[model samples]
Target: GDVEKGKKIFIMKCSQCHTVEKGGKHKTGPNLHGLFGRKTGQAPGYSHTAANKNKGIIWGEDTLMEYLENPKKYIPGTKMIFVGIKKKEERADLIAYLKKATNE
Candidate 1:
Protein backbone atom coordinates (compact mmCIF):
# COMPACT_ATOMS: atom_id res chain seq x y z
CA GLY A 1 0.00 0.00 0.00
CA ASP A 2 1.67 3.11 -1.18
CA VAL A 3 0.77 6.31 0.62
CA GLU A 4 1.42 8.35 -2.50
CA LYS A 5 -0.98 6.29 -4.52
CA GLY A 6 -3.41 6.43 -1.65
CA LYS A 7 -3.21 10.20 -1.62
CA LYS A 8 -3.88 10.23 -5.31
CA ILE A 9 -6.91 8.07 -4.71
CA PHE A 10 -8.10 10.43 -2.03
CA ILE A 11 -7.55 13.55 -4.06
CA MET A 12 -9.55 12.06 -6.88
CA LYS A 13 -12.29 10.27 -4.98
CA CYS A 14 -12.59 11.64 -1.46
CA SER A 15 -11.25 15.20 -1.18
CA GLN A 16 -14.52 16.66 -2.35
CA CYS A 17 -16.24 15.22 0.67
CA HIS A 18 -13.52 14.88 3.32
CA THR A 19 -10.60 16.98 4.48
CA VAL A 20 -7.32 15.66 5.90
CA GLU A 21 -5.79 18.94 6.92
CA LYS A 22 -6.15 19.96 10.57
CA GLY A 23 -9.11 22.23 11.24
CA GLY A 24 -10.25 22.06 7.65
CA LYS A 25 -13.92 22.71 7.10
CA HIS A 26 -16.35 19.93 6.50
CA LYS A 27 -17.83 19.62 3.06
CA THR A 28 -20.26 16.95 1.93
CA GLY A 29 -18.58 14.74 4.56
CA PRO A 30 -16.99 15.66 7.84
CA ASN A 31 -13.44 16.79 8.37
CA LEU A 32 -11.18 13.78 8.92
CA HIS A 33 -8.28 15.25 10.83
CA GLY A 34 -7.24 13.11 13.77
CA LEU A 35 -9.84 10.58 12.71
CA PHE A 36 -8.24 7.37 13.96
CA GLY A 37 -9.62 5.74 17.12
CA ARG A 38 -12.74 7.90 17.12
CA LYS A 39 -16.31 6.70 17.20
CA THR A 40 -18.52 7.16 14.18
CA GLY A 41 -20.43 10.41 13.71
CA GLN A 42 -18.51 12.17 16.48
CA ALA A 43 -17.29 15.17 14.59
CA PRO A 44 -18.30 18.42 16.21
CA GLY A 45 -20.89 20.44 14.32
CA TYR A 46 -21.20 17.78 11.68
CA SER A 47 -24.62 16.24 11.52
CA HIS A 48 -24.42 12.53 10.84
CA THR A 49 -27.19 10.29 9.63
CA ALA A 50 -28.99 8.18 12.20
CA ALA A 51 -27.40 4.91 11.17
CA ASN A 52 -23.96 6.39 10.99
CA LYS A 53 -24.24 8.15 14.35
CA ASN A 54 -25.34 4.98 16.05
CA LYS A 55 -23.05 2.47 14.31
CA GLY A 56 -20.58 2.79 17.24
CA ILE A 57 -17.65 2.00 15.00
CA ILE A 58 -14.24 3.15 16.12
CA TRP A 59 -12.13 3.98 13.09
CA GLY A 60 -9.19 1.63 12.53
CA GLU A 61 -7.54 -0.35 9.76
CA ASP A 62 -9.83 -3.37 9.84
CA THR A 63 -13.11 -1.55 10.31
CA LEU A 64 -12.16 1.13 7.84
CA MET A 65 -11.19 -1.49 5.32
CA GLU A 66 -14.56 -3.15 5.60
CA TYR A 67 -16.48 0.08 5.56
CA LEU A 68 -14.54 1.43 2.62
CA GLU A 69 -15.30 -1.64 0.58
CA ASN A 70 -19.03 -1.07 0.80
CA PRO A 71 -20.23 1.79 2.92
CA LYS A 72 -23.98 1.43 2.56
CA LYS A 73 -23.74 -2.34 2.51
CA TYR A 74 -21.79 -2.66 5.74
CA ILE A 75 -23.83 0.03 7.49
CA PRO A 76 -27.25 0.25 6.03
CA GLY A 77 -28.95 3.65 6.21
CA THR A 78 -25.64 5.45 6.16
CA LYS A 79 -26.09 8.68 4.22
CA MET A 80 -22.79 8.39 2.38
CA ILE A 81 -23.31 7.82 -1.33
CA PHE A 82 -19.94 6.35 -2.17
CA VAL A 83 -19.82 3.21 -4.32
CA GLY A 84 -16.75 2.10 -2.32
CA ILE A 85 -13.36 0.81 -3.41
CA LYS A 86 -13.84 -2.59 -4.99
CA LYS A 87 -10.17 -3.41 -5.35
CA LYS A 88 -8.54 -4.81 -2.23
CA GLU A 89 -5.14 -3.29 -2.88
CA GLU A 90 -6.63 0.14 -3.53
CA ARG A 91 -8.49 -0.02 -0.28
CA ALA A 92 -5.29 -0.97 1.50
CA ASP A 93 -3.48 1.91 -0.12
CA LEU A 94 -6.17 4.37 0.87
CA ILE A 95 -6.22 3.08 4.42
CA ALA A 96 -2.49 3.40 4.74
CA TYR A 97 -2.70 7.00 3.60
CA LEU A 98 -5.55 7.81 5.90
CA LYS A 99 -3.77 6.24 8.86
CA LYS A 100 -0.96 8.70 8.45
CA ALA A 101 -2.83 11.76 7.16
CA THR A 102 -5.64 11.62 9.67
CA ASN A 103 -3.39 11.07 12.71
CA GLU A 104 -1.37 13.50 14.71
Candidate 2:
Protein backbone atom coordinates (compact mmCIF):
# COMPACT_ATOMS: atom_id res chain seq x y z
CA GLY A 1 0.00 0.00 0.00
CA ASP A 2 3.03 2.26 0.36
CA VAL A 3 1.70 3.93 3.46
CA GLU A 4 4.82 5.99 4.12
CA LYS A 5 4.74 7.39 0.65
CA GLY A 6 1.03 7.75 0.95
CA LYS A 7 1.44 9.98 4.01
CA LYS A 8 3.56 12.19 1.85
CA ILE A 9 0.89 12.26 -0.76
CA PHE A 10 -1.65 13.14 1.91
CA ILE A 11 0.48 16.01 3.12
CA MET A 12 0.96 17.52 -0.29
CA LYS A 13 -2.46 16.79 -1.69
CA CYS A 14 -4.85 16.50 1.25
CA SER A 15 -3.38 18.30 4.28
CA GLN A 16 -4.47 21.55 2.80
CA CYS A 17 -7.99 20.86 4.03
CA HIS A 18 -8.02 17.61 6.02
CA THR A 19 -6.46 16.01 9.06
CA VAL A 20 -6.44 12.25 9.56
CA GLU A 21 -5.76 12.13 13.28
CA LYS A 22 -8.64 11.50 15.59
CA GLY A 23 -9.86 14.74 17.19
CA GLY A 24 -8.00 16.73 14.63
CA LYS A 25 -10.07 19.76 13.88
CA HIS A 26 -11.43 20.67 10.49
CA LYS A 27 -9.50 22.89 8.16
CA THR A 28 -10.98 24.57 5.15
CA GLY A 29 -12.38 21.12 4.54
CA PRO A 30 -13.30 18.70 7.30
CA ASN A 31 -11.42 16.72 9.87
CA LEU A 32 -11.21 13.10 8.67
CA HIS A 33 -11.27 11.23 11.94
CA GLY A 34 -12.77 7.76 11.55
CA LEU A 35 -13.12 8.29 7.84
CA PHE A 36 -13.98 4.78 6.82
CA GLY A 37 -16.75 2.42 7.86
CA ARG A 38 -19.13 5.29 8.41
CA LYS A 39 -22.28 6.71 6.94
CA THR A 40 -22.84 10.50 6.56
CA GLY A 41 -20.48 13.32 5.56
CA GLN A 42 -17.94 11.91 8.12
CA ALA A 43 -16.73 15.18 9.59
CA PRO A 44 -19.02 15.97 12.46
CA GLY A 45 -20.66 19.42 12.39
CA TYR A 46 -19.40 20.03 8.89
CA SER A 47 -22.19 20.96 6.54
CA HIS A 48 -22.50 18.55 3.61
CA THR A 49 -24.69 19.62 0.75
CA ALA A 50 -23.43 16.56 -1.07
CA ALA A 51 -24.37 14.22 1.76
CA ASN A 52 -27.77 15.77 2.16
CA LYS A 53 -28.48 15.79 -1.56
CA ASN A 54 -27.24 12.25 -2.11
CA LYS A 55 -28.40 10.13 0.77
CA GLY A 56 -27.26 6.67 1.89
CA ILE A 57 -23.73 7.02 0.56
CA ILE A 58 -21.48 4.86 2.64
CA TRP A 59 -17.78 5.61 2.35
CA GLY A 60 -15.85 2.50 1.38
CA GLU A 61 -12.95 1.37 -0.72
CA ASP A 62 -14.91 1.41 -3.95
CA THR A 63 -16.16 4.96 -3.42
CA LEU A 64 -12.84 6.35 -2.14
CA MET A 65 -10.96 5.03 -5.15
CA GLU A 66 -13.18 6.91 -7.54
CA TYR A 67 -13.66 9.90 -5.26
CA LEU A 68 -9.99 10.46 -4.60
CA GLU A 69 -9.30 10.45 -8.29
CA ASN A 70 -11.84 13.20 -8.80
CA PRO A 71 -13.96 14.44 -5.89
CA LYS A 72 -16.08 16.96 -7.81
CA LYS A 73 -16.49 14.46 -10.62
CA TYR A 74 -17.24 11.67 -8.15
CA ILE A 75 -19.74 13.69 -6.09
CA PRO A 76 -20.87 16.78 -7.82
CA GLY A 77 -21.49 20.05 -5.89
CA THR A 78 -19.42 18.89 -2.93
CA LYS A 79 -17.50 21.70 -1.22
CA MET A 80 -14.16 19.91 -1.10
CA ILE A 81 -12.75 22.28 -3.80
CA PHE A 82 -9.95 19.86 -4.39
CA VAL A 83 -8.71 18.84 -7.78
CA GLY A 84 -8.15 15.38 -6.32
CA ILE A 85 -5.36 12.90 -6.85
CA LYS A 86 -4.55 12.15 -10.48
CA LYS A 87 -2.54 8.94 -10.27
CA LYS A 88 -4.17 5.64 -9.45
CA GLU A 89 -1.10 4.52 -7.56
CA GLU A 90 -1.15 7.72 -5.57
CA ARG A 91 -4.78 7.19 -4.72
CA ALA A 92 -4.02 3.63 -3.64
CA ASP A 93 -1.25 4.68 -1.34
CA LEU A 94 -3.27 7.56 0.04
CA ILE A 95 -6.25 5.31 0.72
CA ALA A 96 -4.00 2.86 2.50
CA TYR A 97 -2.65 5.58 4.71
CA LEU A 98 -6.13 6.91 5.31
CA LYS A 99 -7.48 3.50 6.28
CA LYS A 100 -4.81 3.19 8.92
CA ALA A 101 -4.52 6.75 10.14
CA THR A 102 -8.19 7.61 10.24
CA ASN A 103 -9.14 4.31 11.82
CA GLU A 104 -11.56 4.75 14.69
Candidate 3:
Protein backbone atom coordinates (compact mmCIF):
# COMPACT_ATOMS: atom_id res chain seq x y z
CA GLY A 1 0.00 0.00 0.00
CA ASP A 2 2.30 2.69 -1.29
CA VAL A 3 5.14 1.33 0.83
CA GLU A 4 7.64 3.25 -1.18
CA LYS A 5 5.78 6.48 -0.61
CA GLY A 6 5.63 5.72 3.07
CA LYS A 7 9.33 5.02 3.13
CA LYS A 8 9.97 8.24 1.29
CA ILE A 9 7.89 10.20 3.71
CA PHE A 10 9.68 8.63 6.65
CA ILE A 11 13.12 9.27 5.23
CA MET A 12 12.34 12.84 4.33
CA LYS A 13 10.51 13.73 7.50
CA CYS A 14 11.56 11.36 10.26
CA SER A 15 15.11 10.40 9.37
CA GLN A 16 16.27 13.88 10.20
CA CYS A 17 16.08 12.84 13.83
CA HIS A 18 14.95 9.24 14.32
CA THR A 19 16.50 6.14 12.84
CA VAL A 20 14.92 2.91 11.60
CA GLU A 21 17.96 0.86 10.73
CA LYS A 22 19.05 -1.44 13.52
CA GLY A 23 21.97 -0.42 15.70
CA GLY A 24 21.89 3.01 14.16
CA LYS A 25 22.37 6.14 16.21
CA HIS A 26 21.35 9.72 15.52
CA LYS A 27 20.42 13.05 17.00
CA THR A 28 17.28 14.15 18.84
CA GLY A 29 15.36 10.87 18.38
CA PRO A 30 15.41 7.12 18.87
CA ASN A 31 16.24 4.16 16.67
CA LEU A 32 13.02 2.65 15.35
CA HIS A 33 14.26 -0.78 14.40
CA GLY A 34 11.65 -2.66 16.38
CA LEU A 35 8.98 -0.11 17.17
CA PHE A 36 5.69 -1.66 15.99
CA GLY A 37 4.71 -3.24 19.26
CA ARG A 38 7.16 -1.18 21.20
CA LYS A 39 6.38 1.52 23.67
CA THR A 40 7.32 5.13 23.23
CA GLY A 41 10.69 6.23 24.60
CA GLN A 42 11.90 2.65 25.13
CA ALA A 43 15.11 3.08 23.26
CA PRO A 44 18.35 2.51 25.17
CA GLY A 45 20.75 5.19 26.34
CA TYR A 46 18.48 7.77 24.80
CA SER A 47 17.36 10.06 27.51
CA HIS A 48 13.61 10.49 27.36
CA THR A 49 11.55 13.26 28.77
CA ALA A 50 9.89 12.01 31.95
CA ALA A 51 6.48 12.52 30.39
CA ASN A 52 6.98 9.68 27.93
CA LYS A 53 9.21 7.39 30.00
CA ASN A 54 7.01 7.47 33.07
CA LYS A 55 3.57 8.12 31.60
CA GLY A 56 3.28 4.66 29.96
CA ILE A 57 3.42 4.99 26.17
CA ILE A 58 2.96 1.71 24.36
CA TRP A 59 3.20 2.04 20.56
CA GLY A 60 0.50 -0.30 19.32
CA GLU A 61 -1.48 0.44 16.15
CA ASP A 62 -4.05 2.54 17.92
CA THR A 63 -1.45 4.33 19.94
CA LEU A 64 0.52 5.14 16.83
CA MET A 65 -2.55 6.54 15.17
CA GLU A 66 -3.25 8.71 18.15
CA TYR A 67 0.29 9.87 18.39
CA LEU A 68 0.41 10.67 14.71
CA GLU A 69 -2.80 12.56 15.08
CA ASN A 70 -1.42 14.70 17.86
CA PRO A 71 1.74 14.11 19.82
CA LYS A 72 0.70 16.55 22.51
CA LYS A 73 -2.53 14.69 23.18
CA TYR A 74 -0.86 11.30 23.26
CA ILE A 75 1.85 12.46 25.61
CA PRO A 76 1.51 15.89 27.00
CA GLY A 77 4.87 17.62 27.12
CA THR A 78 6.35 14.88 24.99
CA LYS A 79 9.74 15.66 23.50
CA MET A 80 8.84 14.46 20.02
CA ILE A 81 8.64 18.05 18.74
CA PHE A 82 6.35 17.01 15.89
CA VAL A 83 2.91 18.53 15.29
CA GLY A 84 1.21 15.54 13.56
CA ILE A 85 0.46 14.03 10.19
CA LYS A 86 -2.53 15.76 8.65
CA LYS A 87 -3.63 13.65 5.69
CA LYS A 88 -5.66 10.57 6.47
CA GLU A 89 -4.14 8.46 3.73
CA GLU A 90 -0.65 9.54 4.70
CA ARG A 91 -1.24 8.47 8.24
CA ALA A 92 -2.73 5.14 7.19
CA ASP A 93 0.06 4.39 4.76
CA LEU A 94 2.76 5.41 7.22
CA ILE A 95 1.27 3.24 9.90
CA ALA A 96 1.19 0.32 7.54
CA TYR A 97 4.84 0.85 6.73
CA LEU A 98 5.65 1.06 10.39
CA LYS A 99 3.97 -2.31 10.98
CA LYS A 100 5.88 -3.85 8.13
CA ALA A 101 9.12 -2.14 9.12
CA THR A 102 8.95 -3.56 12.61
CA ASN A 103 7.49 -6.89 11.43
CA GLU A 104 4.51 -6.57 13.68
Candidate 4:
Protein backbone atom coordinates (compact mmCIF):
# COMPACT_ATOMS: atom_id res chain seq x y z
CA GLY A 1 0.00 0.00 0.00
CA ASP A 2 3.01 2.24 -0.19
CA VAL A 3 3.01 4.48 -3.24
CA GLU A 4 5.98 6.66 -2.47
CA LYS A 5 6.88 7.41 -6.08
CA GLY A 6 3.37 8.39 -6.91
CA LYS A 7 3.15 10.43 -3.76
CA LYS A 8 6.11 12.42 -4.96
CA ILE A 9 4.56 12.95 -8.34
CA PHE A 10 1.28 14.02 -6.82
CA ILE A 11 3.05 16.43 -4.54
CA MET A 12 4.94 17.93 -7.44
CA LYS A 13 2.37 17.85 -10.23
CA CYS A 14 -1.03 17.60 -8.63
CA SER A 15 -0.55 19.66 -5.47
CA GLN A 16 -0.47 22.78 -7.58
CA CYS A 17 -4.08 22.34 -8.59
CA HIS A 18 -5.64 19.89 -6.15
CA THR A 19 -5.89 19.62 -2.39
CA VAL A 20 -6.18 16.38 -0.45
CA GLU A 21 -6.97 18.04 2.86
CA LYS A 22 -10.45 18.89 4.01
CA GLY A 23 -11.89 22.40 3.91
CA GLY A 24 -9.47 23.23 1.16
CA LYS A 25 -10.42 25.83 -1.37
CA HIS A 26 -11.08 25.10 -5.00
CA LYS A 27 -8.22 26.48 -7.01
CA THR A 28 -7.62 25.89 -10.72
CA GLY A 29 -9.33 22.56 -10.15
CA PRO A 30 -11.12 21.00 -7.20
CA ASN A 31 -10.17 19.70 -3.82
CA LEU A 32 -9.42 16.03 -4.38
CA HIS A 33 -10.13 14.80 -0.87
CA GLY A 34 -12.52 11.89 -0.81
CA LEU A 35 -12.14 11.47 -4.53
CA PHE A 36 -12.25 7.72 -4.89
CA GLY A 37 -15.99 7.23 -5.09
CA ARG A 38 -16.91 10.67 -6.35
CA LYS A 39 -18.02 11.70 -9.80
CA THR A 40 -16.06 13.96 -12.11
CA GLY A 41 -16.44 17.74 -11.68
CA GLN A 42 -18.68 17.49 -8.64
CA ALA A 43 -16.81 19.89 -6.44
CA PRO A 44 -18.43 23.09 -5.35
CA GLY A 45 -17.30 26.42 -6.88
CA TYR A 46 -15.80 24.61 -9.83
CA SER A 47 -17.52 25.19 -13.13
CA HIS A 48 -18.86 21.96 -14.53
CA THR A 49 -20.47 21.45 -17.89
CA ALA A 50 -23.26 19.10 -18.77
CA ALA A 51 -20.85 17.25 -20.98
CA ASN A 52 -18.43 16.90 -18.08
CA LYS A 53 -21.18 15.71 -15.79
CA ASN A 54 -22.70 13.39 -18.37
CA LYS A 55 -19.32 11.94 -19.21
CA GLY A 56 -19.98 9.83 -16.12
CA ILE A 57 -16.50 9.37 -14.75
CA ILE A 58 -16.30 7.68 -11.42
CA TRP A 59 -13.16 8.24 -9.40
CA GLY A 60 -11.77 4.74 -8.80
CA GLU A 61 -8.72 2.80 -9.83
CA ASP A 62 -9.94 1.74 -13.28
CA THR A 63 -11.49 5.03 -14.35
CA LEU A 64 -8.68 7.11 -12.91
CA MET A 65 -6.12 4.87 -14.60
CA GLU A 66 -7.84 5.23 -17.97
CA TYR A 67 -8.12 8.96 -17.51
CA LEU A 68 -4.51 9.21 -16.50
CA GLU A 69 -3.50 7.36 -19.66
CA ASN A 70 -5.48 9.74 -21.91
CA PRO A 71 -7.69 12.25 -20.21
CA LYS A 72 -8.95 13.93 -23.36
CA LYS A 73 -10.08 10.61 -24.77
CA TYR A 74 -11.54 9.34 -21.51
CA ILE A 75 -13.67 12.40 -20.95
CA PRO A 76 -13.93 14.30 -24.19
CA GLY A 77 -14.47 18.06 -24.11
CA THR A 78 -13.22 18.20 -20.55
CA LYS A 79 -11.24 21.16 -19.31
CA MET A 80 -8.38 19.23 -17.73
CA ILE A 81 -6.08 20.28 -20.60
CA PHE A 82 -3.37 18.00 -19.33
CA VAL A 83 -1.03 15.96 -21.48
CA GLY A 84 -1.87 12.63 -20.01
CA ILE A 85 0.66 10.21 -18.57
CA LYS A 86 1.76 7.36 -20.83
CA LYS A 87 3.49 5.04 -18.39
CA LYS A 88 1.35 2.28 -16.89
CA GLU A 89 3.31 1.85 -13.70
CA GLU A 90 3.17 5.55 -13.03
CA ARG A 91 -0.57 5.51 -13.43
CA ALA A 92 -0.90 2.56 -11.05
CA ASP A 93 1.33 4.24 -8.54
CA LEU A 94 -0.49 7.51 -8.85
CA ILE A 95 -3.85 5.88 -8.33
CA ALA A 96 -2.53 3.90 -5.42
CA TYR A 97 -1.25 7.04 -3.75
CA LEU A 98 -4.43 8.94 -4.51
CA LYS A 99 -6.66 6.17 -3.22
CA LYS A 100 -4.68 6.22 -0.02
CA ALA A 101 -4.31 9.99 0.21
CA THR A 102 -7.96 10.64 -0.41
CA ASN A 103 -9.06 7.88 1.93
CA GLU A 104 -10.89 5.86 -0.69
Ranking by TM-score: 1, 2, 4, 3
Tens-place lDDT digits, model 3, residues 40-102: 777877888888887676787778777888888878988889888888788777877777775
The segments of candidate 3 whose C-alpha lies over 4 angstroms from its true place after superposition are: none
Candidate 1 residue pairs that clash: none
* Candidate with maximal TM-score: 1
lDDT of 2 by residue, 1-104 (tens): 79999899999888988888888987788788887878757468777776434745677777799888887887777877878787888899989888889985
Query: What local lDDT score does residue 79 receive in model 1, on the 0 to 100 scale?
Result: 84
For model 4, the run of ten residues with the poorest summed lDDT: 43-52
TM-score of each: 0.95, 0.89, 0.86, 0.87
TM-score of 3: 0.86
Better candidate number, 1 or 3, judged by TM-score = 1
Looking at model 2, the pairs that clash are: none
Give, for candidate 2, the lowest lDDT window spanning 10 residues: 48-57
